[PDB]
Amino acid sequence: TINYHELETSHGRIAVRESEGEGAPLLMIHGNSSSGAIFAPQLEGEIGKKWRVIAPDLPGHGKSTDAIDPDRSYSMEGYADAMTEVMQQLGIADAVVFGWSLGGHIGIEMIARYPEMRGLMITGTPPVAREEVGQGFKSGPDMALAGQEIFSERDVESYARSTCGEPFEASLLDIVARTDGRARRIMFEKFGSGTGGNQRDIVAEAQLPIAVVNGRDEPFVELDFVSKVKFGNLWEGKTHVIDNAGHAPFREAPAEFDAYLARFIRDCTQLEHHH
Ligand SMILES: CCCC(=O)N[C@@H](CCO)C(=O)O
């Protein structure tokens, strides 16, 4: 059973899905124009059966309302504020965080806001300073849509297919079509302007374990760039790459992805801790 409920937050009404796992909590943060529903394989599978998986919808996304104040909410740092508020309301201070793409950038901005975070895993996310956006991401037509407010029908399909990978289904179009397009435009502009904390410096200086897991056929992220990013505490000492997966290995290759995620959660929550 996945438990669905809604929170009244300062950002708006936020939808939250939780598994019934008895173990340590995992906050999973979805990507641009997606929804926590995308994490069905984890919510409903072995990960969610053991651990308390929490998969909200960002303001403007999924089953959440649009933001009360788009100018406050629709940015990497604004979303980080919102997720921190969600975790406050849920009464959970020590989650492991998994962030997918935009969600990974949000997770990076959460490091300063959510001090008892036990670890952060980022997938589809190159930590970049504002001037490095061109280096960390692959230029292309779908990448261009990340910051585009108005999507045509073909835009919705192209973006959904490229972000979610195989297998595709119609429900994904519904998720992407719902997204408040203002959120795309404002977030991307603010990202390029560096309105939040410099993510390159944040990950270099962060002491908590940071895990990096990507699909080899990533269409958005430059894996060469990612493999050169300095992390304060890179989990297992390297960035990880999964064959036969692209931007969304958690759904494209769930068993292989789950091996990494489960091991990371175990390492961050059930190993003896020494400074
Ligand atoms: C570029 C800002 C972060 C972002 O929107 N990432 C996208 C991938 C690129 O289209 C995502 O969240 O999937």
Residue numbers in the entry: 2 to 276
What does the paper say about this structure?
N-Acyl homoserine lactonases (AHL-lactonases) have important functions in decreasing pathogenicity by degrading AHLs. Unlike most AHL-lactonases, AidH is proposed to be a member of the α/β-hydrolase fold family. Taken together, the present results reveal the catalytic mechanism of the metal-independent AHL-lactonase, which is a typical acid–base covalent catalysis.
The crystal structure of wild-type AidH complexed with the product C4-HS (AidH–C4-HS) was determined at 1.09 Å resolution. Following the lactone-bond breakage of N-butanoyl homoserine lactone (C4-HSL), the reaction product C4-HS features newly formed hydroxyl and carboxyl groups. The C4-­HS contains the O atom derived from the water molecule. The new carboxyl group forms hydrogen bonds to Ser102 and His248. In addition, the new hydroxyl group shows a rotation of approximately 98° around the axis of the C—C bond, resulting in a stretched conformation, and perfectly stabilizes this conformation by forming a hydrogen bond to Tyr160, which shifts by 1.3 Å compared with the substrate–enzyme complex. Tyr160 clutches the substrate and the product at the active site and positions them in the correct conformation via hydrogen bonds. The entrance to the substrate-binding tunnel is in the open state upon substrate or product binding. Moreover, the size of the entrance varies with different substrate acyl-chain lengths.
